[PDB]
Structure 1
Amino acid sequence: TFVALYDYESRTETDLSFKKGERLQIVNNTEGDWWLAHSLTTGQTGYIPSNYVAPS
């Protein structure tokens, strides 16, 4: 499970926003600058930016 270091503020409804402390399961994208993770709360999708999170 990855951890959101910086609060990611999404501008659209597609990618969900997460504050500092929310965890998300990484789906794919090992590099680049935009990965997709699935929150473990409501069980929805949340394109998390490669930046703003870190494996921990």
Structure 2
Amino acid sequence: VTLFVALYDYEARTEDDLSFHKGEKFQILNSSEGDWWEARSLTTGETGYIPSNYVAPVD
């Protein structure tokens, strides 16, 4: 289970970066190293690069 859980919302005022909310789930897709990964949601279907290093999965 490499699924990440949303913690809170974020205020992104850019083009690359996007805003998101909690209660959603993000699927893996990117595999560079550990920085800005994509956020694939099976809900809205909106991508965006953000730092989801402050979150955590569910065991």
Gap change, CA 1:54 and 1:9, over 3 Å in 2: farther
Specify the structure having the higher radius of gyration (Cα): 2
Partner of 2:52: 50
Alignment of 1:7-18 (within 5 A): 7-18=9-20
Q: How far 1:30 sits from its partner (Å)? A: 6.6
Gaps of 5+ in 2: none
> Number of paired residues?
56
Partner of 2:43: 41
Superposed structure 1 runs of 4+ greater than 6 Å apart? none
Q: How far 1:32 sits from its partner (Å)? A: 2.6
Please tell me whether the aligned partners of residues 29 and 36 of structure 1 are also in contact (alpha carbons under 8 angstroms): no
- CA RMSD of superposed structures (Å): 2.3
Scaled by the length of structure 1, what TM-score is found? 0.59
Gaps of 5+ in 1: none
